Amino acid sequence: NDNIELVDFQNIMFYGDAEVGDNQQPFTFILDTGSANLWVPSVKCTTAGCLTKHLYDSSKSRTYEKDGTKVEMNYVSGTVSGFFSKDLVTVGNLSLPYKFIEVIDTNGFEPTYTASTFDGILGLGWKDLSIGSVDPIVVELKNQNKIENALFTFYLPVHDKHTGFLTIGGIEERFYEGPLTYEKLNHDLYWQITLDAHVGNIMLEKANCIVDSGTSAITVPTDFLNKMLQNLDVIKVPFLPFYVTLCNNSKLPTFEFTSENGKYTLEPEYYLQHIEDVGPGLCMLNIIGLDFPVPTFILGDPFMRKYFTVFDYDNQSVGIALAKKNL
Numbered sequence: 001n002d003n004i005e006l007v008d009f010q011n012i013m014f015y016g017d018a019e020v021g022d023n024q025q026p027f028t029f030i031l032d033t034g035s036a037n038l039w040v041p042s043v044k045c046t047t048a049g050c051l052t053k054h055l056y057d058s059s060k061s062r063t064y065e066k067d068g069t070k071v072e073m074n075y076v077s078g079t080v081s082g083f084f085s086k087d088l089v090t091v092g093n094l095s096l097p098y099k100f101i102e103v104i105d106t107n108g109f110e111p112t113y114t115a116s117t118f119d120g121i122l123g124l125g126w127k128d129l130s131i132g133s134v135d136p137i138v139v140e141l142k143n144q145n146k147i148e149n150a151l152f153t154f155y156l157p158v159h160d161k162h163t164g165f166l167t168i169g170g171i172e173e174r175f176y177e178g179p180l181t182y183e184k185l186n187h188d189l190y191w192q193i194t195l196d197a198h199v200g201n202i203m204l205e206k207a208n209c210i211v212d213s214g215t216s217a218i219t220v221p222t223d224f225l226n227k228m229l230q231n232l233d234v235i236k237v238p239f240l241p242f243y244v245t246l247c248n249n250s251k252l253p254t255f256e257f258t259s260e261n262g263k264y265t266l267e268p269e270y271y272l273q274h275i276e277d278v279g280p281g282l283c284m285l286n287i288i289g290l291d292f293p294v295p296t297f298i299l300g301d302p303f304m305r306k307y308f309t310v311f312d313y314d315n316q317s318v319g320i321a322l323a324k325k326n327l
């Protein structure tokens with residue numbers, strides 16, 4: 001199985017590296033299960049954000065195949081735009097020709113872009129979520145028979161303790177302890193499963209839960225959040241949807257998620273972010289209120305830091321298991 005090392009960036013996000021072009025041009029990616037396109041910033045970039053990035057130069061790649069088609073990717077955090085290009089993409093020791101976006105304007109993706117040290121985003125979603133109708137990397141590698149299974153695996157790094165791996169094509173027992181529980185997808189094209197959500201006395205039955213690698217938070221329905229925070233001794237930051245607390249706050253709850261198959265819990269230690277610079281013994285909650293059309297939680301980074309996760313295209317399932325504290 002091919003492995004890609006995952007490095008932590010300030011306990012908000014993680015990255016892994018990969019190559020685009022036979023020139024072996026090396027890029028740092030956010031690895032995002034909730035999107036289905038790959039992009040890298042071009043040498044043709046007109047914007048300030050591209051200043052400090054590894055830039056893609058199609059003139060230095062002999063496997064480059066032109067495709068002028070203009071495209072923009074609209075994320076919740078902003079927009080990047082440019083054009084489609086084709087070239088050899090290499091993930092670990094697995095290569096395949098691939099269609100991706102050459103980004104020339106990142107101004108709509110500020111301040112996220114210039115803030116952090118990633119170059120681009122590598123989607124790990126489903127095909128019907130892609131622009132330009134791009135087969136996902138793992139399913140092509142499967143199809144081309146470079147890996148056993150159409151699946152990938154996340155063992156996330158933890159700040160100041162160990163590194164992580166994205167593993168492609170097969171499941172390695174070393175990453176987790178206890179049982180590995182599979183949860184069927186309740187949607188065709190998202191890593192979305194059904195779970196009862198419990199926080200104290202507040203309960204949502206058969207809630208949609210999206211396992212998502214690119215979101216640095218647990219997201220919660222706004223009504224559910226407003227009930228959770230009632231008398232919690234937490235304070236909202238002015239103008240921003242973030243809550244601050246004493247790290248030691250005895251009332252901070254444990255999320256409990258359950259299926260017929262399993263039980264997954266998330267204790268304060270996984271969703272708190274120390275902000276010692278702002279004040280002594282203060283923490284931010286990595287919890288955001290957000291309403292999808294159907295009541296939904298995003299089980300983001302903080303969930304995935306605790307739980308090893310198996311994303312299975314062939315079995316339309318998400319495997320979940322408690323991550324080992326170190327390898």
Ligand SMILES: CSC[C@H](NC(=O)Cc1ccccc1)C(=O)N[C@@H](Cc1ccccc1)[C@H](O)C(=O)N1CSC(C)(C)[C@H]1C(=O)N[C@H]1c2ccccc2C[C@H]1O
Binds near residue numbers: 032074077112212293
């Ligand atoms: C096919 S990509 C376009 C997609 N847009 C949508 O789904 C539109 C939408 C919006 C609200 C409800 C329902 C649907 C999208 O941006 N999805 C994102 C996940 C998402 C988040 C909220 C609501 C719906 C989907 C993406 O997978 C991601 O992690 N992204 C886009 S870019 C990113 C890799 C930096 C990261 C990010 O923004 N992360 C930030 C985020 C998002 C929500 C809560 C906290 C935070 C902090 C930070 O981590």
Ligand SMILES: C[C@H](CCC(=O)NCCC[N+](C)(C)CCCS(=O)(=O)[O-])[C@H]1CC[C@H]2[C@@H]3[C@H](O)C[C@@H]4C[C@H](O)CC[C@]4(C)[C@H]3C[C@H](O)[C@]12C
Binds near residue numbers: 110112241288290
């Ligand atoms: C996705 C949700 C909800 C968006 C929403 O509720 N938007 C209503 C208006 C919708 N529009 C009319 C504009 C278009 C769609 C209408 S339509 O009906 O067509 O769908 C919004 C609301 C608050 C947003 C976060 C904060 O900012 C702080 C921070 C800023 C960074 O920079 C990026 C990260 C982060 C965490 C943000 C991410 C995300 O962005 C959040 C969660």
Ligand code: NA
Binds near residue numbers: 032033034212213
């Ligand atoms: Na995501």
